[PDB]
Amino acid sequence: YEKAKEVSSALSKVLSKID
Amino acid sequence: NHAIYEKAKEVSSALSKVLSKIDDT
Amino acid sequence: MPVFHTRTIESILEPVAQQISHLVIMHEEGEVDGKAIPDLTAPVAAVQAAVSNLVRVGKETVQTTEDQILKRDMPPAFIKVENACTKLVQAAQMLQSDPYSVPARDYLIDGSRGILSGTSDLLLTFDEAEVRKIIRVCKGILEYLTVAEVVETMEDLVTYTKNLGPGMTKMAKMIDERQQELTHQEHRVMLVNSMNTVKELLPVLISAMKIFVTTKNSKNQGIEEALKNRNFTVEKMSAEINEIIRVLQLTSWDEDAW
16 A cells, blocks of 8 residues: 555655754 | 734834933933 | 843843933932933824834734733733833923923833833733743644554554644744744753654654554564554653643743633
8 A cells, every 4th residue: 555655755744844 | 913022112112212312421 | 120031022122121221320320310301202202102002902912812811911011011101201291391300210210111111021921822822732742642552554644644744843833933032041952952852753653653553464473562662752752742841831931820
């Protein structure tokens, strides 16, 4: 599932914001 | 709201002019 | 008073707070009632107008606000600056008559301090309500963090991250502006250091979740550890967030709220 891929992608977008 | 700070600067400025109108020597 | 508990409030009331010190300092030596000052009927008319706008806004601020504490703490700050402004006006008249009146200088001083004080309370009260907005957000993150213990699937993980991410972002942005306005190093450090840790651990908390949600999926594998590691990050982050709430709490709590 893209689930694990999405979970990461979503966390990435967030961390970039937290940046 | 973030204006309260605006008006606060205006009263802080007016009070200043008044105070400095008593300052000279 | 040096009621500048913020770096912005300070930069605003500092300049004028100094001039007031002189007036008092000089009026003590007897050098204030000295000079025959010009007409302050124009300038005093300005501050009187400036105070009206300040009061007006504050009145609206209370009108809109949902904060009950700010709702009941602001009004007085109004009254303070309002009547302290009248002493200012009075002194202007007293001086328009006699440019040497020593009691006019008494009002001229008591009034300036009332304006500066009232303005301080006004801002400080407002600001403290803003700090409660941060505390609320933090208390929110704290809550959701625990929700990370019921995430049992990739789909759940996706959802969780999607939610934590935003709030995690908001409190990060709020703590950023926050630490800047602080007027004490020690607080700023803790506030900053603690928020950093939370940032550092977030990706770690997501890993512990993926590993668990996966190792648990990979059925028949060591899971008592993944759990323990997930619950630890949840605890660590939760602890950091409490240091933040505690600090923000220490640097704004004005005891009229009991």
